[PDB]
Amino acid sequence: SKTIRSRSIWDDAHAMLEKAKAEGISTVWDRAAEQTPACKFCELGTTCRNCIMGPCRIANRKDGKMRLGVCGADADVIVARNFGRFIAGGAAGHSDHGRDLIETLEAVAEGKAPGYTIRDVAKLRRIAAELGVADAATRPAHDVAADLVTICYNDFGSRRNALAFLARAPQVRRDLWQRLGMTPRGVDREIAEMMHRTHMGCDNDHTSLLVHAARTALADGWGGSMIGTELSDILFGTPRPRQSTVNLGVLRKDAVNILVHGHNPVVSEMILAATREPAVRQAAQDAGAADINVAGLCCTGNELLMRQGIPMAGNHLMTELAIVTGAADAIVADYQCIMPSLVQIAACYHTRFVTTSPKGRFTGATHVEVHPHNAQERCREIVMLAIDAYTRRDPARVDIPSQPVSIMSGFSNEAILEALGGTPKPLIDAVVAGQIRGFVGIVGCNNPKIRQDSANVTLTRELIRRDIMVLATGCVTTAAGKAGLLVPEAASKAGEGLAAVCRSLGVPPVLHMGSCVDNSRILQLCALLATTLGVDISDLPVGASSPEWYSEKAAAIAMYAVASGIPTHLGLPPNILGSENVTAMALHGLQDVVGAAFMVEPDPVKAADMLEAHIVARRARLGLTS
Amino acid sequence: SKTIRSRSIWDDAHAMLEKAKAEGISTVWDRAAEQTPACKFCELGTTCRNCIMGPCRIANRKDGKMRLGVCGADADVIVARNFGRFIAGGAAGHSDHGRDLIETLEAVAEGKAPGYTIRDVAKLRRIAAELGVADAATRPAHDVAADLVTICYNDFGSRRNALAFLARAPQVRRDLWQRLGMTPRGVDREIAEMMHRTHMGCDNDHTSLLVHAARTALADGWGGSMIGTELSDILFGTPRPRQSTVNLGVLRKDAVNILVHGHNPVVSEMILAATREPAVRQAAQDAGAADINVAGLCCTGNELLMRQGIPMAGNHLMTELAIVTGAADAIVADYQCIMPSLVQIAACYHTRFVTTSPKGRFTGATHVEVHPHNAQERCREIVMLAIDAYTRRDPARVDIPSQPVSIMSGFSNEAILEALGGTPKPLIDAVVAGQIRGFVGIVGCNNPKIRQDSANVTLTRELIRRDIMVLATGCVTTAAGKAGLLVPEAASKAGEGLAAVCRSLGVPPVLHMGSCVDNSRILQLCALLATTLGVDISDLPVGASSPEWYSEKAAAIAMYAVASGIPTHLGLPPNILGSENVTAMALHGLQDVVGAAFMVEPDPVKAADMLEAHIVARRARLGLTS
Numbered sequence A, B: 001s002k003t004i005r006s007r008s009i010w011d012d013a014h015a016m017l018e019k020a021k022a023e024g025i026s027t028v029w030d031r032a033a034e035q036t037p038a039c040k041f042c043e044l045g046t047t048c049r050n051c052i053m054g055p056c057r058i059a060n061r062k063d064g065k066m067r068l069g070v071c072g073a074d075a076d077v078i079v080a081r082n083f084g085r086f087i088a089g090g091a092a093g094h095s096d097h098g099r100d101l102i103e104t105l106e107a108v109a110e111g112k113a114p115g116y117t118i119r120d121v122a123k124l125r126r127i128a129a130e131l132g133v134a135d136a137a138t139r140p141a142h143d144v145a146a147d148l149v150t151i152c153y154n155d156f157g158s159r160r161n162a163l164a165f166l167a168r169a170p171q172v173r174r175d176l177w178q179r180l181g182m183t184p185r186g187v188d189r190e191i192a193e194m195m196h197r198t199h200m201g202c203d204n205d206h207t208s209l210l211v212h213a214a215r216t217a218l219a220d221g222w223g224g225s226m227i228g229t230e231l232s233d234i235l236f237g238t239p240r241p242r243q244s245t246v247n248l249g250v251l252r253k254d255a256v257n258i259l260v261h262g263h264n265p266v267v268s269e270m271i272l273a274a275t276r277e278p279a280v281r282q283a284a285q286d287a288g289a290a291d292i293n294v295a296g297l298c299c300t301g302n303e304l305l306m307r308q309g310i311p312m313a314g315n316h317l318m319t320e321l322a323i324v325t326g327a328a329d330a331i332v333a334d335y336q337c338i339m340p341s342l343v344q345i346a347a348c349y350h351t352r353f354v355t356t357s358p359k360g361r362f363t364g365a366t367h368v369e370v371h372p373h374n375a376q377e378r379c380r381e382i383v384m385l386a387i388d389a390y391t392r393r394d395p396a397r398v399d400i401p402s403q404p405v406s407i408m409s410g411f412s413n414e415a416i417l418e419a420l421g422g423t424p425k426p427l428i429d430a431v432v433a434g435q436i437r438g439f440v441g442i443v444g445c446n447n448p449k450i451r452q453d454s455a456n457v458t459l460t461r462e463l464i465r466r467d468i469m470v471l472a473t474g475c476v477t478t479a480a481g482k483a484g485l486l487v488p489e490a491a492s493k494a495g496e497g498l499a500a501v502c503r504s505l506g507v508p509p510v511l512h513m514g515s516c517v518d519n520s521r522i523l524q525l526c527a528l529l530a531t532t533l534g535v536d537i538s539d540l541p542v543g544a545s546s547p548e549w550y551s552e553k554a555a556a557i558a559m560y561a562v563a564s565g566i567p568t569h570l571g572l573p574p575n576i577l578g579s580e581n582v583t584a585m586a587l588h589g590l591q592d593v594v595g596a597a598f599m600v601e602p603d604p605v606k607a608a609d610m611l612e613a614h615i616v617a618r619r620a621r622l623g624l625t626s
C-alpha cells in the first residue's frame, strides 16, 4: 500500500510489512502511529517527575501560573536535567558493555572461561604497554592480561584524575577539558554524579548541567566504549577487511536460521562457535536442514561481521520483519535495543526467543543465562533449541524476500593503517591535496518518524559525491550495505578525488568501522591525526551525523563527539526545545566553548551542505583549499 | 486564617506564611497549588521518555489502543523502569555524599586539608580493624586512615563481590541476598547498572527491574550512606547525647545569622570554625552585631546538631520561611533538597545565598567553592560575606516569630550502647519482657500534599503510646523536637512499659539518630540485634515509616529498609499505581521475596495500627509470650 511504501525505502521491508498486514501482526510503525500525537510537555522536555512534590509541567499561561515546578525549578533546569539523565542512560549502556569485556578478559587470564582465549596477543601487548604495564612485551600473555584488567577496572573506580585512554587525545584538548571541568575521571563515577546532580535541589544551573553531561559522555567515548572496543579486539581478533552480505535474504530456507541480537560479542561469538561444532552440525542435518546459518541483527551483528564476516540480516527497524519471514528458528538476545514486541511476534511462529543476560530479562522469554564459565556449554544448549524449533517450522508461512547484497567489512584503525602502508602519511597527503576533503562518521539508528534508511542513504551518497569519505558504524552499516556503498567498486559512486584514493588503496568510499561502541575507533583516529599534525581535534576536517537516531546511546555518542571537537548532526531534535537557552547552548553556545556544536536538520541534502560547510571552514584554518 | 492553618501545624510556619502572603512571596505551597491537578499519566507512572521513538503514554482501554509503547513495552515495564531510575537518583545522592567523606579523610591522611583532622582516632582504629586493616590498633593513625580510605574507595569500584560493611548483616540475610541476586557489589556500579537496565530494549521484566532496584538501594544503605556516617564520625566526632533547641526562634535579631543548608558536614563544620576566629568575631562586632549565630537547616543542620549541639532552625518546608523572617544574613548551601526558590526569596531581602559545591550550582547564587585544601580560607571569606550582608539588613522587615524549644540529640549507636552499660542486653531484655514492644524508625521529609508535620507528629505520638520506641532521623527530627518529644520528660507521653525503660536510662522515648545518611545507624542497630539473637533482621520487631516523604532519597531509604527485612510505611504512593502488578509486588509480593513489604497509608493512626500489627507478628516469630 501507500502506507507500507512510506515506512521504508527497502524492498525486503515492504514485502514483510505486506506479510505482517495479511497475518494481522502489528509492528513498530503501527505502535508509533498509536503514540502520535505525543504529549506536548514530554516532547518539549518541560515536564519533571523527579520527586513526589511533583509531577510538574512548565507552561506559558496568561495567568503566569505553572512557570515553575513545585521546588521552584524553571524550564531551563528541568530541560537540562532531563537531557542529562538521558545522556547518562546512554553512557551507562556503553559502560556496562565495556565492564562485561573486562570481566571476560579477567576470566581468561584466570583460566576460568572455557572456549575464550586471547585471540590477538600482539594487540594485548601493545595496549598493555601503552597504558603502562611493565614488561608487557615479554611476560606471559595471561600475566599481562591480568595487569591490563587492573588498569581497566581502575577506570571504573573513583581514584583517577583522568581516564587511562584520555592520553590519546591531543594535549591541547586535554588542557581545555581540564579548564572547563569536563575531564572524565571514572566511567561509573560520572554517571552516578549525573544522577545526583539531577535530584531535586542539587544542580540548578543549566550550564553546569550541560557541562557535566559532556563529562559523562566523554567517560563513555574515551572510557566505557574505548575499553569495550579494544578488549573485544583482544579477545576476538582485530578486524581486517573481508567480504560478506546483508539483508533479509541472508536467511536460508534450507538451513536452521539463528539470529543474534543485542550488543555483546561475548555471547554471539560463542553461539557462532557452537554452530561450528561437528556434533551440533550433525544434529541439524538429522533434522533435515542443510546447515546452520547464523545471521546478525544490530550491534552484535556488526561485531560478528567485523571479526568473522557473518552476514547481517538487518538493522533496528528490520528486527521485527526478520521474524515475519517465518524462517527465524531462534533469536538469541543479550541486551540493548531489543524491542520487547519481538517476544510476541516470535510467539506467532515456531521461533524461540532466548535471553542470555541477567540484565536483559523479557517476560515470556526462554532464559538460558550465559557467563564466561558456562558459555561453551550453554551456547551449545541454545543452538540445540534452535535445531529442535526448526523441525516445527511452518513452510507455508516462510517468505524470504530479496537476494543478499555484497559488502566489505572490517575497517579497524589497524586495518586502515595497514592499507595505507603503516603510517597515516598517504591519508594526510590526500587531505592536503584535496582529493579527500574531509571525513564524516555516520552513526546510529533508525526511527519510525523517518522513512527507514532514507536519510542514512541519501546523506552517505551526498557526502561521498563531494569527496568526503564516510566512516560508518552501527545501524547505518546495513543501510550503506544495502545501497551498495560498502564495496571497493562503489568508488564509482564517489567524486573524482575520493574515487582515485579508494582505487589506489583498494578500499570502499564508505568504511565500515564497526558497532556503536566502535565509534571509539573514530575518536582514536581523530586523536592520531590531530597529534600527528600538532593540532586539536577541533581543527580537523571532520564531522559526525546520526540522521535517524532514536536511543539514549546515540545521544551520548553525539555529545562525546561534540565535546571532543567534532561537529555533529542529528536528524531529529532531542526533547529539549522547551528551553530556548538549553537549545541555544547545544546548537550555538558549545561552538565557542568546545570548538563544535550540535546541528539539527531533517533534510539529508541540507545536512550534507552543513557538514560540508564546517569541513570547508576547517580546511581554510589549516591553510588548505577546497 | 483557615488556608494558612491547613498548610502546617506550627505557629512559626503560620506566622511566616502570613508574612510571605503580605509581601507577595510565593512559597512551595503556592507552587504546589499551581501544579494541581497533576498529569494523570505522570502520576500513575504510565509515561515514558527514555528514547525519541516516544515519548509514550499507556492507557487502559477495551479496544487496546496505546496499550504499549512504540518499542512494545507495557505498563508493568514502563512503571518498573521509572521507579528504578527514581530509586537510582536517591542512591546517587547518598553515594556522592559518602564519596566526599572518603576524599576528605584522604586529604587529612596526606596532610593536605588545613583545619581538618581525625577527631575520633579510637573509632578510626576500630572501623579499620573491623574492615581488615592490618595492625589497626598500633600503626600511625595517618597510615591506618590511608588503608581505610583504600577499602572505602574499593567499594566505589567494580571488583568486589560484596560491599565491605555488608559483613555486619546476619549470615542468613547475606545468604538470601546472594541467592536473590540482590547483594550490593559496588556503590556506583549498581547505579550505572540501573541506568543501563532502563534503556530501551534492555531489562523488560518488572520483577527483574524491582530486584535490581533493591540491590541499588542496598548499595546505598550498606555502602554510600554507611561509609558517609562512619567516616563523618571519624572526621568530626562520634555523637553523644546533648541538649539543643529548635524552631525559627533560634535566629537572633542581635546577631549575624548564618543558616547552613544541604547535607555535607565537610562544609558546615568549617563554617562553624570560621565564626569562632577572633578577627572574624571582631569584624561582626564592628558591624554592630553581638555575636555570629550559626543555625542548621535539613540534613547538614542535623549533622551539626548531632556533633556540636548547634540549634536547628527548621526542616524542608520551613526553609523558605526562614528567609521570610528577615533575619537570615546568609544561607550557605552545599547540595541536595535546596529549593531553587530560595535564590529568588533571598533576593527579596538582603540575604546572601552562597553555594559551595561544584555539584550544587544555582543560577544567580554567589559561588564560593569549598574543597578540603582551601576550606579554612574560603569559609572565612564566606563568613565575611555574611557580616557584610548583616550591615544591609532592614530592621523594619524582621519578624522572628517564636521562642525556641529544647531537644535532646546525639544518639549514635555508640551513645545508645553506652547508656545501656556497654552491651545491648538491657534493651533485648526490655523487648523480651514486653516493656518495649518494638522499634520504628520514622524518617524522611515534608511534602506540601500533607499538612506540614501533621502525620509525622501524630504517628510518633501514636507509637510511643503503644510502647513502641521511635528512632527519628532527617526532617522528622525537627517535627518531633517542636512537638516536645525529644526530651526525657516526654516519657510521660509514652505507654507504661516504654516510659519505665526511658526513665531508667534517662533518655527520651524518641531518639534522635541523625541525618538521612544516618539511617545507616538504624541498619547497624538492627543487624547487631539480629546477630546477637541469632535471627534475621526480618525476624525483629521493627518497622520504618516516612509519613510525609517527597525525595528520591527517601524512596531509596524505604527500599533498602524493605530489602533488609524491615516493613516500611509511606504516607503517599510513589508514581506506580498505573501498574497493578508493580503495585502488588511492592505492597504484597516482596513480603515473600525479602521478608518485608511497603505499606501506603495517609491516615497516621491507621499507619500506627499497621506497624503495630507487623510488630505483633514478629514477636510471635520470636516466640515471645509477654
Ligand code: SF4
Pocket (backbone or CB within 6 Å): A048, A049, A050, A051, A052, A053, A054, A055, A056, A069, A070, A071, A072, A073, A078, A199, A200, A201
Ligand atoms: S524536582 Fe522540582 S520540578 Fe521536578 S517533580 Fe520535584 S518539585 Fe517538580
Ligand code: SF4
Pocket (backbone or CB within 6 Å): B048, B049, B050, B051, B052, B053, B054, B055, B056, B069, B070, B071, B072, B073, B078, B199, B200, B201
Ligand atoms: S523506551 Fe519504549 S516506551 Fe519508552 S519512550 Fe522509547 S519507545 Fe516509548
Ligand code: FES
Pocket (backbone or CB within 6 Å): A039, A040, A041, A042, A047, A057, B039, B040, B041, B042, B047, B057
Ligand atoms: S505524560 Fe505527563 S507530562 Fe507528558
Ligand SMILES: [Cl-]
Pocket (backbone or CB within 6 Å): A536, A538, A565, A593, A594, A595
Ligand atoms: Cl577548540
Ligand SMILES: [Cl-]
Pocket (backbone or CB within 6 Å): A567, A595, A596, A614
Ligand atoms: Cl566547527
Ligand SMILES: [Cl-]
Pocket (backbone or CB within 6 Å): B404, B405, B406
Ligand atoms: Cl523548652
Ligand SMILES: [Cl-]
Pocket (backbone or CB within 6 Å): B536, B538, B565, B593, B594, B595
Ligand atoms: Cl526473610
Ligand SMILES: [Fe+3]
Pocket (backbone or CB within 6 Å): A299, A337, A444, A445, A474, A475, A516, A553
Ligand atoms: Fe546502536
Ligand SMILES: [Fe+3]
Pocket (backbone or CB within 6 Å): B299, B337, B444, B445, B474, B475, B516, B553
Ligand atoms: Fe532528608
Ligand SMILES: [Mg+2]
Pocket (backbone or CB within 6 Å): A180, A181, B358
Ligand atoms: Mg569546576
Ligand SMILES: [Mg+2]
Pocket (backbone or CB within 6 Å): A592
Ligand atoms: Mg574562540
Ligand SMILES: [Mg+2]
Pocket (backbone or CB within 6 Å): A538, A595
Ligand atoms: Mg573552530
